[PDB]
């Protein structure tokens, strides 16, 4: 009973290929998974992460050149518009040629860069207030600096917008990164040698006097200034509450309630916030409502920002949209990111072009880019099969909840409540290939130069912020998908309660037809229910079915939800990272990936077993000497073969709200009875502790 189709043959070969059966599985079930792989593979030059999974994401830039690179005579102006972009990025001769005047022709429009220009204060500081400058970079170029206003859904009436107050992003990866001492030391070195090598390629090409001392000073100041800001800022493990998150004031409220002094104004939210709404025609009452996400971060900043010049301020906000642009001009320009993005990256090269342009005309025409992707690569049946197959884990998740001791009754009810009501989307919107003129409708205020890749580039920067302004006073839509179809990725929205598997997903390991149903739940079925679970996780658990923030659970379920979350808070923080210099992951702030993974693992397994109850064992797989419940494991672990960049590690244990893979994998098996029944563990084997987390 050995299947032989070659469809067999290739699962086999690859799982074949990766694995180390020299290892015990109950000793390390991601060397055992993985151990082939690492011995086999180098991380690539231009890569920070290399892995199974980011070999799937190099795999689909292969397609989006394909079917990008050739004009074709009957495409739509949609189309045409995406390959007309993609053309104009690939054209280093073009881009080189312009050297920084791109750059140069857009500073007077943001109110200079201090740094780098003469006699600042007689041309812009006259007419410099913070107000008026933070505004353009945000309205105009979609850049948010000292101050994060948005417009975004609200988070207690998911139909609506509001205008949305959050503390900003920073220049480095994250706040831990201006302490600048010891693992950090390097980046925060690079980052201001990067402001100055910038001013001064600047001042070159403008015919400047250049005083390296004065550059030194100025660039010293920035960060010096950024410093306070990073300090300012909330940490994540103070935000992962979205009810302690949300603060609705009115725009009078906040005028009374956080004041600041700018270069000594002082500061005006109702004319800042007009001077962004300004952009798209719509006016702002000083009684406006406005979600205030970080109260504590404006009331430190009036402090900060009271001892600086509106120079000062000035060669930082610059700083911070240059910062974007400088790898779209020429190769000078490019260059002088190079140490930078070693530091946070580890890389010694950048991608090759054309993956980059790929990715930016896919990042920017998801839709046309989506259509041409699911054209050249995905079935039209997969679809059918995943749609049965979310069915079937939302019926699994529903059912556990009567196995759970830990919620009472009532909130079991509301919990079923949300699942029913989860709106599940699969590998693509069929309106993106059978409807000519919306699709094209979406890109009609576009045009696109073919010499003029920064203008292009520019112009999507104005595009996508000026649409996002223009609906405050809109509805949300709830037929638009979260993502693209050209991602390796799902997804789960909490405003929208919907969960979403582009096409680019499904794909082995993960999914097909045609591969076993043990390799699909151990994948692709274990990211449905991570999804799912996401609407469950201590984010999600806060939204109702419809996506509104409003508690539906009981006291004692609540603090039981803690409870049980808390054992993987600790069991993950315990974890120690060689990459990242021996430091422990953050348990907490891995928390709402950790419960998704721990939880959709469970349910996709119970699935296979139901699978196998209704319809009998499968053939096994030749070459393996492993049956199916094993094989289920095994390939829900190779989807994290891979390994970091130390640089990279450095920046992920802080940035990313994932576990690292090879801890994704140990933590949830460790975790997984299932697991060790399957591999006969003897008790507290490394993979098989005594103390189990469970929370879904
Ligand atoms: C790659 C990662 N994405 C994910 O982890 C999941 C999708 C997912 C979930 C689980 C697995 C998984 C597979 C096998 C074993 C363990 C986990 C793989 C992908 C998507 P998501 O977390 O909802 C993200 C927020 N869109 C990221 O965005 O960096
Ligand atoms: C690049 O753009 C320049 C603009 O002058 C043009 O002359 C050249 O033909 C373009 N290259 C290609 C191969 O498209
Ligand atoms: C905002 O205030 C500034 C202060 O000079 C003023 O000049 C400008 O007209 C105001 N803009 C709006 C949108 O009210
Ligand atoms: C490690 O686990 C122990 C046991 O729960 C816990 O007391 C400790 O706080 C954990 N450490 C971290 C950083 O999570
Ligand atoms: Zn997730």
Known sequence: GICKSSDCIKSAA???????????????????????????????????????????????????????????????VAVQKAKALYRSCINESAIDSRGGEPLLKLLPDIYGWPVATENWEQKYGASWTAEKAIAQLNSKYGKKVLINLFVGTDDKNSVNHVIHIDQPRLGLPSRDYYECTGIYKEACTAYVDFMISVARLIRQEERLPIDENQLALEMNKVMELEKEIANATAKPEDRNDPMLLYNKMTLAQIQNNFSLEINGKPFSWLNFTNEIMSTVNISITNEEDVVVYAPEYLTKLKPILTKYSARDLQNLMSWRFIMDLVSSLSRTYKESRNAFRKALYGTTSETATWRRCANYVNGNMENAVGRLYVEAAFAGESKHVVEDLIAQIREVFIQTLDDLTWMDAETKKRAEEKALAIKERIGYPDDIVSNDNKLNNEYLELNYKEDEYFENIIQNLKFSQSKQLKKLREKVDKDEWISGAAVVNAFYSSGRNQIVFPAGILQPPFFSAQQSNSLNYGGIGMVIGHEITHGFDDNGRNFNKDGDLVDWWTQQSASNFKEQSQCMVYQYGNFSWDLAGGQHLNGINTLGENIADNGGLGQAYRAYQNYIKKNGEEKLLPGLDLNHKQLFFLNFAQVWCGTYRPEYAVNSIKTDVHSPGNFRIIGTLQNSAEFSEAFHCRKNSYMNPEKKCRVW
């Open 14 to 76: 690859r799982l074949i290929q990766n694995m180390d059966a020299t290892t015990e599985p109950c000793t390390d079930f991601f060397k055992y998974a993985c151990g082939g792989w690492l011995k086999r593979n180098v991380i690539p030059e231009t890569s920070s992460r290399y892995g199974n999974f980011d070999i799937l994401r190099d795999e689909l830039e292969v397609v989006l050149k394909d079917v990008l690179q050739e004009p074709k005579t009957e495409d739509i």
